[PDB]
């Protein structure tokens, strides 16, 4: 049978599935179809968040049923970029953010262009193509900003 999985972003995603399949199973299909990891996926039917260990059957989901998909919104921290005078500015970032776009966030917050930004961590100057994760920045941390 077919069911429909509607994203909050407006895309409707159609899925071949059987009445006794698990919520885990459905998630895996969605991953294969759209590349969203299952641990990020929250499936909802009739206002009810659907639990991993139960079946479609268990929530009375049938032929032509539409499900809602929303993504988990994980967070926890903010890095700090300090100047030498002691002034601090905070940024929201992921480990996978490039140094380029950390600078781009600094251009967006304060006025400064990335060409004029020297970012330092653990005494090392940070190179634009690398990520924060390359430099083992995996939670709230302190970078130094020096001006060029």
């Amino acid at each position: 049978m077919q069911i429909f999985v509607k994203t909050l972003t407006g895309k409707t995603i159609t899925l071949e599935v059987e009445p006794s399949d698990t919520i885990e199973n459905v998630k895996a299909k969605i991953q294969d179809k759209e590349g969203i990891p299952p641990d990020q996926q929250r499936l909802i039917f009739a206002g009810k968040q659907l639990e991993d260990g139960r079946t479609l059957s268990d929530y009375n989901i049938q032929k032509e049923s539409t499900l809602h998909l929303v993504l988990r919104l994980r967070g926890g921290m903010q890095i700090f970029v300090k100047t030498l005078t002691g002034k601090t500015i905070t940024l929201e970032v992921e480990p996978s953010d490039t140094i380029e776009n950390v600078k781009a966030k600094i251009q967006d917050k304060e006025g400064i262009p990335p060409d004029q930004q020297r970012l330092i961590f653990a005494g090392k100057q940070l190179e634009d193509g690398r990520t924060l994760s390359d430099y083992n920045i995996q939670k709230e941390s302190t970078l130094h900003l020096v001006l060029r």
């Binding site: 909050l8 206002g47 009810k48 929303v70 988990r72 967070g75 903010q78 992921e94 709230e140 302190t142």
Partner: protein, 299 residues
């Protein structure tokens, strides 16, 4: 005890290692509101699960009481909570990773304390589903009120409240880090749930916000329009590796002023022209939290 014990640098719950999801939700839920106080008070019953007591005792005695009398809670205490969390759900990063407040609420309320579901909803005429919070879901006005979102989301899945909730936590319509249905949302100060019941009012007491990776919190500590505070568990940092964070709580009365304006006035206002901390309340809302009215005076 007093407002001024709560406000300042080195106030609130000290964040540590991706903790902002937990810090901010506990701050929303317990810094001024008492809606869930009983959860910290219900005696251990034989139907209760293994860490029930240690967890309850930790929350009341090492987290909430100190937050309320001293205005401050060390990260060590939150870390004790996170370990308990990790023991109940192994290998799910409760001690080190960025998480969703939803994840946190569900483990804590559903698995450990065994809080009766906060919301009982019926996809109308069907039978009831239980949950701790509601997800706004609907199809794409430019700046909707949370009142509208709730109504629209209810109609979209033909839903009703089976009974009047005491604590209604509503998740804003977002799809991951990178997508917001709406650029700004007006968090209604009061919710009227009359036409959404099967068989009336609720008051906004907090908004949990996040731009992309860090949770912060806005809290209403009185009925006055201006009685808003903002909390960042990681406002500042001291040191490097063994460095520690400094949480901050700040008065943000501007919030009250922007919420006297209409959605269309706020819509015409460029987010860069919105003062103080109000930008984040209007643009980064993640959860709006409503309670049975205690602060207000009916008139």
């Amino acid at each position: 005890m007093g407002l001024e014990v709560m406000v300042g640098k080195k106030k609130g719950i000290q964040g540590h290692y991706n903790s902002s999801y937990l810090d901010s939700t506990l701050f929303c839920l317990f810094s001024f509101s008492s809606v869930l106080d009983t959860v910290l008070l219900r005696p251990r019953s034989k139907t209760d699960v293994e860490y029930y007591k240690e967890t309850q005792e930790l929350l009341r005695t090492e987290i909430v009481n100190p937050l309320r009398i001293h205005g401050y809670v060390c990260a060590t205490k939150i870390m004790k909570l996170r370990r308990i969390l990790e023991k109940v759900e192994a290998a799910s990063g409760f001690t080190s990773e960025q998480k969703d407040p939803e994840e946190f609420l569900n483990i804590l309320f559903h698995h450990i304390l065994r809080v009766d579901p906060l919301l009982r909803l019926r996809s109308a005429g069907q039978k009831v589903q239980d949950c701790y919070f509601y997800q706004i879901f609907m199809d794409k006005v430019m700046v909707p009120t949370s009142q509208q979102l709730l109504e629209w989301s209810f109609i979209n899945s033909d839903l009703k409240f089976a009974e009047a909730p005491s604590c209604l936590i509503i998740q804003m319509p977002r799809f991951g880090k990178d997508f917001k249905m709406f650029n700004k949302i007006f968090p209604s100060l009061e919710l009227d749930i009359t036409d959404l019941l099967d068989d009336q009012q609720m008051e906004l007491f907090a908004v949990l916000c996040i731009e992309t990776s860090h949770y912060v919190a806005f809290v209403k500590y009185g009925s006055a329009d201006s009685a808003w505070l903002f909390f960042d568990s990681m406002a500042d940092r001291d040191g490097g590796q063994n460095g520690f964070n400094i949480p901050q709580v700040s008065r943000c009365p501007e919030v009250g002023e922007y919420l006297k304006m209409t959605p269309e006035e706020l819509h015409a206002l460029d987010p860069k022209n919105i003062q103080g901390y109000a930008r984040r309340l209007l643009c980064d809302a993640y959860m709006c939290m409503y309670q049975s009215p205690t602060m207000s005076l009916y008139k």
